[PDB]
Amino acid sequence: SGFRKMAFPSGKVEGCMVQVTCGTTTLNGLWLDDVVYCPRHVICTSEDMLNPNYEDLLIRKSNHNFLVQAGNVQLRVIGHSMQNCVLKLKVDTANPKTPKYKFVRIQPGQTFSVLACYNGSPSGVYQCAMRPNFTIKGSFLNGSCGSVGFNIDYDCVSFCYMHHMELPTGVHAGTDLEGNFYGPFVDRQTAQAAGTDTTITVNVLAWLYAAVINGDRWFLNRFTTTLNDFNLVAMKYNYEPLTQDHVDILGPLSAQTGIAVLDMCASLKELLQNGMNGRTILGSALLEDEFTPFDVVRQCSGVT
Amino acid sequence: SGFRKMAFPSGKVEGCMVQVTCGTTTLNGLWLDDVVYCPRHVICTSEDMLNPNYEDLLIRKSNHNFLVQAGNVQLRVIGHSMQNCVLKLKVDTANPKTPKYKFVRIQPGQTFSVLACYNGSPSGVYQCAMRPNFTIKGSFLNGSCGSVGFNIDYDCVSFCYMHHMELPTGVHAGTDLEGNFYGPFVDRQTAQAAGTDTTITVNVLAWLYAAVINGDRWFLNRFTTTLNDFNLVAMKYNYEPLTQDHVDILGPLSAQTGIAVLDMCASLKELLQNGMNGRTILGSALLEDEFTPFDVVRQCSGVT
Numbered sequence: 001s002g003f004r005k006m007a008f009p010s011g012k013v014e015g016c017m018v019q020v021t022c023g024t025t026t027l028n029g030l031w032l033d034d035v036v037y038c039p040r041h042v043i044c045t046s047e048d049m050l051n052p053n054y055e056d057l058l059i060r061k062s063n064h065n066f067l068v069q070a071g072n073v074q075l076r077v078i079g080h081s082m083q084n085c086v087l088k089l090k091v092d093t094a095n096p097k098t099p100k101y102k103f104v105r106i107q108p109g110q111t112f113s114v115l116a117c118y119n120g121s122p123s124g125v126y127q128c129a130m131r132p133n134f135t136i137k138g139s140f141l142n143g144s145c146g147s148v149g150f151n152i153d154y155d156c157v158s159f160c161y162m163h164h165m166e167l168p169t170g171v172h173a174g175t176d177l178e179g180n181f182y183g184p185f186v187d188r189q190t191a192q193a194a195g196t197d198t199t200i201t202v203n204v205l206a207w208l209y210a211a212v213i214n215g216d217r218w219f220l221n222r223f224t225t226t227l228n229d230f231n232l233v234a235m236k237y238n239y240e241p242l243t244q245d246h247v248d249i250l251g252p253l254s255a256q257t258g259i260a261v262l263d264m265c266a267s268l269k270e271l272l273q274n275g276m277n278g279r280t281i282l283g284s285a286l287l288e289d290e291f292t293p294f295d296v297v298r299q300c301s302g303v304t
Numbered sequence: 305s306g307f308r309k310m311a312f313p314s315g316k317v318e319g320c321m322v323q324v325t326c327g328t329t330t331l332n333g334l335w336l337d338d339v340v341y342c343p344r345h346v347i348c349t350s351e352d353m354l355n356p357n358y359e360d361l362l363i364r365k366s367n368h369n370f371l372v373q374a375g376n377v378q379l380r381v382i383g384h385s386m387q388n389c390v391l392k393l394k395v396d397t398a399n400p401k402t403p404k405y406k407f408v409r410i411q412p413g414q415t416f417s418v419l420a421c422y423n424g425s426p427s428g429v430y431q432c433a434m435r436p437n438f439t440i441k442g443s444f445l446n447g448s449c450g451s452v453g454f455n456i457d458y459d460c461v462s463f464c465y466m467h468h469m470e471l472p473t474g475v476h477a478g479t480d481l482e483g484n485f486y487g488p489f490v491d492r493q494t495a496q497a498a499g500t501d502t503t504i505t506v507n508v509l510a511w512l513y514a515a516v517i518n519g520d521r522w523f524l525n526r527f528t529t530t531l532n533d534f535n536l537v538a539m540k541y542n543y544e545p546l547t548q549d550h551v552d553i554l555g556p557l558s559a560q561t562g563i564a565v566l567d568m569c570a571s572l573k574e575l576l577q578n579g580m581n582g583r584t585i586l587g588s589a590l591l592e593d594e595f596t597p598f599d600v601v602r603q604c605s606g607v608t
């Protein structure tokens with residue numbers, strides 16, 4: 001019993017973290033096989049960041065200008081290329097600690113663990129969600145760029161996120177491991193709008209199933225609703241419209257608890273319309289949307 | 305910017321997790337040097353747990369009855385002894401992945417990371433606090449026993465917790481790495497009372513400093529208070545009495561923000577008396593007490 005915002009064990013990712021220096025800039029890199037991936041803004045200076053011409057800036061750089069340090073050993077750089085907003089530094093040594101890995105582009109609403117790093121050294125690990133507006137509400141400071149987000153399926157690490165920017169609003173923006181930013185964000189120090197962020201309805205419902213599984217049942221009621229009626233309420237409270245796909249994904253949790261998905265929606269509808277009334281659910285005074293149905297099943301069944 | 309419930313990177317601890325089987329029971333063990341530490345209730349059966357006589361039960365066991373598996377290799381057990389509520393299995397091989405480590409007994413209110421494990425395999429990592437009543441609000445299932453709690457100072461892992469029990473109330477109880485339980489709890493399947501749990505006042509204040517540092521300032525007000533006046537309010541709301549030690553520990557956060565500790569106490573006093581009024585602080589609708597002043601400084605300064 002008990003339910004926590006659990007992150008994946010970070011060991012497989014710590015073994016890939018390197019430090020990348022280019023000129024005066026130092027940030028983190030990801031060493032997998034003979035390649036170090038890092039944000040391309042490592043080649044920029046404080047003046048450059050207003051409107052950098054990355055192709056022009058990268059032309060002024062040679063393999064020897066990229067200093068890559070793994071712990072305390074220096075890696076020799078034999079190649080450099082730009083792929084979208086990431087630089088790929090080919091090194092002469094394959095990382096002996098490379099785990100089985102994939103590069104995956106996650107969907108908004110999906111969750112992942114972040115290993116925040118500074119100077120190629122890991123400082124902490126936390127569980128995040130890619131917001132519907134493609135931002136992440138992380139915990140990153142100057143030097144954290146290059147820190148990655150990932151998921152783990154037994155021995156395979158799926159890298160999904162690389163940290164690049166903090167938006168003026170304090171929220172975080174980054175790329176997949178191919179350098180494609182999530183959302184409309186560009187790697188420029190300019191005014192950038194994160195869209196309207198909605199609440200991940202399927203995740204909130206999954207978390208209500210986790211609550212019932214773990215003893216918190218007060219919010220359960222004698223009511224039911226329809227997908228259309230529920231979505232009228234979701235619209236008003238800036239929640240993601242619930243679809244039959246979402247209902248189907250909640251199927252295992254519905255079967256485990258014996259509470260029909262639309263019955264759980266009616267409970268959520270009443271929580272949205274009436275609030276918590278000073279009560280808590282799983283130790284929280286708000287509706288938690290950073291646990292997917294998969295996270296709930298995994299945590300409630302002890303998947304290692 | 306941003307503030308998350310961040311756990312330490314778990315790599316150094318994953319490399320120590322082994323599986324310990326004894327009879328029909330399987331749980332986790334901690335392999336450091338040539339010793340595997342695990343909860344002594346590994347020698348028990350379902351009948352035994354009502355009132356086990358551990359000295360008598362352990363006498364029926366020999367080195368060969370303790371099956372220790374590290375990943376997929378079997379460890380040879382050349383010694384076994386009981387130290388309080390932990391069994392120490394001497395193995396013939398020192399763990400090649402043993403980090404620099406200490407065994408420390410934490411204080412109530414201090415925080416730590418837990419690496420939840422099943423069958424000697426890590427499943428997730430989360431940040432916890434040792435409650436004032438010596439319980440932890442963890443996320444553990446059957447098989448999680450032997451999972452450890454720890455802190456990291458650069459390269460040294462300080463092990464502070466070993467998971468042993470889930471109390472009938474759904475809260476978790478365990479020991480230091482010498483087998484001494486935190487709190488009055490015993491390793492018997494009996495009625496066990498966790499005392500009155502209070503809110504860790506110094507941690508809530510530290511989290512209010514983290515909020516101001518990270519942009520959330522609405523709760524700040526034109527008032528001040530005294531340690532005695534604040535403690536009258538803390539008493540009423542089951543908060544830990546604030547002492548001059550607590551004030552002194554908040555000194556670095558007070559100096560960083562320029563907000564006197566007693567001014568922050570007045571803000572907390574008003575939040576206790578008036579509630580949040582449907583607002584949030586650092587994305588939370590309640591007063592968070594699982595970040596110590598040290599955690600706040602560490603996260604806000606990027607200590608690796």
Ligand SMILES: CCc1ccncc1NC(=O)Cc1cccc(C(F)(F)F)n1
Pocket residue numbers: 041049140141142143144145164165166172186187188189305
């Ligand atoms: C406050 C520093 C910080 C904090 C939390 N995450 C990240 C950072 N760092 C940055 O955002 C660096 C930076 C500044 C300007 C422009 C760019 C861009 F090229 F990516 F667009 N990067």
Ligand SMILES: CCc1ccncc1NC(=O)Cc1cccc(C(F)(F)F)n1
Pocket residue numbers: 001345353444445446447448449468469470476490491492493
């Ligand atoms: C529900 C299983 C579980 C879940 C979350 N943490 C732990 C557990 N397991 C146990 O508590 C095992 C157990 C049962 C009875 C008595 C004892 C004791 F000897 F330690 F006292 N241990």
